[PDB]
Amino acid sequence: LVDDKIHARSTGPYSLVTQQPLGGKAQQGGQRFGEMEVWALEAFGAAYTLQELLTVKSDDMQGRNEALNAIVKGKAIPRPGTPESFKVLMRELQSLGLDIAVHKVETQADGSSLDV
């Protein structure tokens, strides 16, 4: 019956490990945007949404919040950061005989660093 399938989530509980909202059917879940779904976004024109959708409504943790806020404030929202599950992937990989140097190349002396 209809009620058997109705849902909504402004926001709610997240995941454990991977903080992205806890989508399972009973309890404030969230719509998963698989590749083929993103294949309908980047296939379209202006795809910010994409971006953000990928993050602030799922992962930049702090990103999440303070967005939220930022609307409550009454203005726009701030630029995102990097989602989580990246950072996670680092970890694994690193945990497996790696030397990941995600890293910038700045200065006129072009500067090679690394990061968190």
């Binding site: 509980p13 997240y14 995941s15 309890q27």
Partner: protein, 156 residues
């Protein structure tokens, strides 16, 4: 404890013999030497954890643990709070800006709970008879309706 547990199991089975399904517990404690409180503790104590991802059940669709969250908190709380901050801030920060400093010094509004009036008295300008006076003064000031009646709703 492993042994104690087993020993209990056997001893309780003896009770079960006379009192089927050993419903006796505290009576079993006459032979268990301890309130069921520990007996039940033992029960849970002797539990083996679960894969966090046994595929759920009634459907092989998913593992477990994928319906909970980490030690983190939802923005909904985060924000509310942070409101508090400023809400306050201004609302305090509209009576005796200097004293307002000590309001954050001898208290929070930053990262001390505290700077013991002692240390604080001199911290701002070296003082002994100008502190708990302006302290209460500050509170009672931002207290009472119109003043405290601003956190009256945001009691966070």
């Amino acid at each position: 404890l492993y042994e104690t547990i087993s020993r209990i199991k056997k001893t309780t089975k003896l009770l079960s013999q006379e009192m089927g399904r050993k419903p006796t517990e505290e009576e079993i404690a006459t032979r268990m030497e301890m309130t069921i409180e520990k007996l039940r503790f033992i029960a849970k104590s002797a539990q083996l954890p679960i894969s966090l991802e046994t595929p759920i059940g009634k459907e092989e669709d998913s593992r477990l643990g994928d319906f909970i969250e980490s030690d983190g908190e939802t923005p909904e709380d985060q924000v509310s709070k942070n409101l508090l901050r400023e809400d306050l801030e201004k609302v305090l920060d509209s009576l005796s800006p200097r004293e307002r400093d000590v309001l954050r010094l001898r208290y929070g509004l930053d990262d001390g709970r505290m700077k013991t009036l002692e240390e604080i008295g001199q911290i701002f300008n070296v003082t002994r008879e100008r502190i708990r006076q302006i302290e209460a003064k500050a509170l009672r000031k931002l207290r009472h309706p119109n003043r405290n009646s601003v956190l009256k709703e945001y009691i966070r």
